[PDB]
């Protein structure tokens, strides 16, 4: 009994008549490149992606970011081609390229990277950490306005936060330096939330910083709705991630319902949901920047629970499932003597009635 | 070797000429079956014998009521040559609590709820 296939055969298009006059791969790399392309295509048969690939909804994820900038491709391309010719005109660059002694400046590349394709890479990088999945329930936004956040450690060193870099709570004990390029007369809204910092509700998040109606780049002049609170990842609870959200306000917004007392050392008030918060302010507010870092437990976390939070620090531990053992049988055939030890609880001798 | 049988799906596809011959309606299929074994399970394979027991068809010429569902129909299509299948018709409707003691299944496949044992006055 044979069933006809539900779709085209993988090698049905190849013609077997003139097999001798067909170009072959002749190499391993050529076949591998073709093999990868077909592995990313849907098939009517069962595939690895069906059981292991991350399922995604047919609905395209909506965009809630700023509109893309308008750039003339023809004018942009004209300058780039001329610059390449001038670079290739110099014989020193070719000699350095031929002798393998040339190098590129990293700082200049990143400054140009941050303005051209930096927002797009960060959006893809944010999706890997599941920020859009949690903060906006899958809704994405392009971080059009880069956000520069750096923590002052000591008096001369700074710890920048680009995207998910490791930051200790000791470095995050005080409010960091927040800077960004903005026009005069515009209003902004800073936000800092810990996605996994919550101790009771897995879905809810803890609010660490909330500044509203920021006039331009002057962060200090902005309203202090929520006082800064250092991150407090519990010991043995893993690695937590805190995301800096920067919003652009179209009109002045009153945050009376979101106002919190200073200081706010109660986790019930510190509870915060980004989805509901943006849902009631999406009309006049739009995300503009994004930055996040990963935080571990250190000695400074003990200070927060004892001094600030006035509570006992909870300590977690990674617990694995108990080992699987089949149902114990009265006569284990061809089993080693250590079979009984697998089903014995106490390692100390027992005597029963004696 | 002798083995089970895979009946093609086209066999169980009633034609329009069959609906005018057996009185059935494809748009409104009947709800319940009336299965009656009319052949011996002897000299038949063991899997046919087991299905007869599962359907409660031990005693021959003893009508049994089953549901017209694909899983039950799957078992019937295996022993379809040993049983007689008739639809269950309800001229008076489903029996109620007061009509349980007055039911009677006639040979035509209809279940009456008023078995009076009295000649029709008409």
């Amino acid at each position: 009994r044979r069933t006809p296939p539900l779709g085209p055969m993988p090698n049905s298009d190849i013609d077997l008549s003139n097999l001798e006059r067909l170009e072959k791969y002749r190499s391993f790399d050529r076949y591998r490149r073709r093999a990868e392309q077909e592995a990313q295509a849907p098939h009517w048969w069962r595939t690895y992606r069906e059981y292991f690939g991350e399922k995604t909804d047919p609905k395209e994820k909506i965009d809630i970011g700023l509109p893309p900038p308008k750039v003339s491709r023809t004018q942009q391309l004209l300058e780039r081609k001329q610059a390449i010719q001038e670079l290739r005109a110099n014989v020193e660059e070719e000699r350095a390229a031929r002798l393998r002694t040339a190098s590129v400046p990293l700082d200049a590349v990143r400054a140009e990277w941050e303005r051209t394709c930096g927002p797009y890479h960060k959006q893809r990088l944010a999706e890997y950490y599941g920020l859009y999945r949690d903060l906006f329930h899958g809704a994405t936004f392009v971080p059009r306005v880069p956000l520069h956040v750096a923590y002052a450690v000591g008096e001369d060193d700074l710890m920048p936060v680009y995207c998910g870099n490791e930051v200790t709570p000791t470095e995050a004990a005080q409010a960091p330096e927040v800077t960004y390029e903005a026009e005069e007369g515009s209003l902004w809204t800073l936000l800092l939330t810990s996605l996994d910092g919550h101790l009771l509700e897995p879905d809810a998040e803890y609010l660490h910083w909330l500044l509203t109606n920021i006039p331009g780049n002057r962060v200090a002049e902005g309203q202090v709705t929520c006082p800064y609170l250092p991150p407090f990842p519990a010991r043995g609870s893993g690695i937590h991630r805190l995301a800096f959200l920067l919003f652009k306000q179209d009109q002045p917004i009153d945050f009376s319902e979101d106002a919190r007392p200073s200081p706010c050392y109660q986790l019930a008030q510190r509870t915060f949901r980004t989805f509901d918060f943006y849902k009631k302010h999406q009309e006049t507010m739009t995300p503009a920047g994004l930055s996040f870092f990963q935080c571990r437990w250190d000695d400074s976390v003990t200070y927060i629970f004892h001094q600030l939070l006035d509570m006992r620090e909870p300590v977690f531990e990674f617990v694995r499932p108990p080992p699987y053992h089949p149902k114990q049988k009265r006569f284990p055939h061809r089993q080693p003597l250590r079979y009984l030890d697998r089903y014995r609880d106490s390692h100390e001798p027992t005597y029963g009635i004696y | 070797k002798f083995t089970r049988s895979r009946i093609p799906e086209k066999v169980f596809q009633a034609s329009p000429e069959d609906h005018e011959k057996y009185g059935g309606d494809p748009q409104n299929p009947h709800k319940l079956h009336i299965v009656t074994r009319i052949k011996s399970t002897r000299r038949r394979p063991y899997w046919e014998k087991d299905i007869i027991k599962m359907l409660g068809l031990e005693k021959a010429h003893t009508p049994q009521v089953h549901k017209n569902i694909p899983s039950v129909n799957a078992k019937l299509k295996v022993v379809k040559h040993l049983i007689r299948i008739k639809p269950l018709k309800l001229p008076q409707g489903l029996p109620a609590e007061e009509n349980m003691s007055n039911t009677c299944l006639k040979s035509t496949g209809e279940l009456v709820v008023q078995w009076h044992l009295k000649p029709v006055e008409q």
């Binding site: 993988p10 090698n11 298009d13 190849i14 097999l19 067909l22 170009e23 072959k24 791969y25 002749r26 190499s27 391993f28 050529r30 076949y31 591998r32 073709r34 093999a35 077909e38 592995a39 098939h43 048969w45 069962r46 595939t47 690895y48 069906e50 059981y51 292991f52 043995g236 609870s237 893993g238 006992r312 620090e313 909870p314 300590v315 977690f316 531990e317 990674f318 617990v319 694995r320 499932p321 699987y324 | -």
Partner: protein, 106 residues
């Protein structure tokens, strides 16, 4: 001669069967089924599950290791555009690695 009995080799765990770590999935003389995700292969081409979960069989693109010369010489003579496929057996993990539990309140 030729009085040898069968080796009782074949599929030990079919599609959808729940297996534990170390359970033998399939025994084969030659590579009829290839190891997939969380599936190990022994000396005698014996497929055993490396993790506890559900067994799945899929068709995947076969890219041989460059060191394996015999299989590399086979794909290099294929017509351009042709792609080889083989059956792979995978184990989809069912339980997570572990959980974080509260142990004390300091």
């Amino acid at each position: 001669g030729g009085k040898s009995s069968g080796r009782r080799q074949g599929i030990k765990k079919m599609e959808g069967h729940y297996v534990h770590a170390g359970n033998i999935i399939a025994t084969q003389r030659h590579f009829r089924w290839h190891p997939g995700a969380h599936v190990g292969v022994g000396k005698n081409k014996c497929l055993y599950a490396l993790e506890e979960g559900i067994v799945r069989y899929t068709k995947e693109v076969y890219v041989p290791h460059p060191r394996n010369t015999e299989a590399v010489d086979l794909i290099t003579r294929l017509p351009k555009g042709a792609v080889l496929y083989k059956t792979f057996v995978h184990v989809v993990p069912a339980k997570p690695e572990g959980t974080f539990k509260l142990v004390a309140m300091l």
